[PDB]
């Protein structure tokens, strides 16, 4: 399944993910593609920060959804 | 009942609806007026994107409420 991530630079990257992929796997894919360590990633969708231990389907993230990458913190668990 | 739908360009669409109408039904009514396919519509109310499958009543949308229409590229 393709999803989009708006990166720190304002560019957008495409990820190929499982329909219920784990948030940790999504961050691992962002690290590989964009280079940001998962610990430094904060991902936002629908006004909510995405949590490790959850999956894309927990957030109703579907094909061609767009996530927003922001620097962690200062949230920031 | 009547509800209002405001575009980002500041036009107000008036719709006749019932609480039991689904969000998809509402998008169809917007298509009748505006020509915009439901797949290109996002409706926002009280801070939340309204999901296809749910009803107006699910979101406590009462008479005279204003929804906000935001366009999207059709999802493939």
């Amino acid at each position: 399944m393709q999803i989009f991530v708006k990166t720190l630079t304002g560019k957008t990257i495409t990820l190929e993910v499982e329909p219920s992929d784990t948030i940790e796997n999504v961050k691992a894919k962002i690290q590989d593609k964009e280079g940001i360590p998962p610990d430094q990633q904060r991902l936002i969708f629908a006004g909510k920060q995405l949590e490790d231990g959850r999956t894309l389907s927990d957030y109703n993230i579907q094909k061609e959804s767009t996530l927003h990458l922001v620097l962690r913190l200062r949230g920031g668990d | 009942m009547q509800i209002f739908v405001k575009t980002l360009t500041g036009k107000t669409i008036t719709l006749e609806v019932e609480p039991s109408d689904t969000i998809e039904n509402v998008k169809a009514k917007i298509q009748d007026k505006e020509g915009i396919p439901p797949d290109q519509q996002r409706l926002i109310f009280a801070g939340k994107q309204l999901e296809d499958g749910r009803t107006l009543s699910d979101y406590n949308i009462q008479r005279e409420s204003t929804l906000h229409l935001v366009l999207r590229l059709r999802g493939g």
């Binding site: 904060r42 936002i44 629908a46 006004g47 909510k48 920060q49 927003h68 922001v70 949230g75 | 980002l8 996002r42 926002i44 109310f45 009280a46 801070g47 939340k48 994107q49 906000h68 935001v70």
Partner: peptide, 29 residues
Amino acid sequence: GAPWNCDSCTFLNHPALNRCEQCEMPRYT
């Protein structure tokens, strides 16, 4: 700070975002 409603579309946005996730309007004017 606090989650913030977009002035245009009302979307309740995460405080880490400077523009609305739905309609791309900046938070403040």
